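Build the 3D complex.
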Amino acid sequence: ELKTYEEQLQSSGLEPAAINVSLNLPPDLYLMRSTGIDMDINYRYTMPPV
Amino acid sequence: GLQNIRGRYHQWMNELPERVSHKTQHLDEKKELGHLSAGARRLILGIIVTFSLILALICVTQPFNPLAQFIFLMLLWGVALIVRRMPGRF
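Done.
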């Protein structure tokens, strides 16, 4: 849902550009507990030869 | 003074039995008055039991972050080291 367009999470070229995903959260996640926000990332890319 | 610290530590060590003996006298001295209203007394010793068990349950169950857990550990360990130096069954 945090895309606003399909081609945001893909970059093709000699030097791939940085993939940035923006989000705004409600000001309620208070600190002093540090529960943890496990941002799972299942990524796939072109494997370098060496 | 530093050398005196050693001798006075032993002085307090010798005082420990002496003070303990005075405390046992006071143990009996306070008992020489330890009486009132049995139903209420049961309530009040029992009142100690409930409040202290609630405090113990909070201490057992409290989630802490790693830093707060480390501070809490170091303070409880400090209390244990102080109490271990005290003589007697208490």
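Chain B touches chain A at residues 63, 65-66 (CB under 8 Å).
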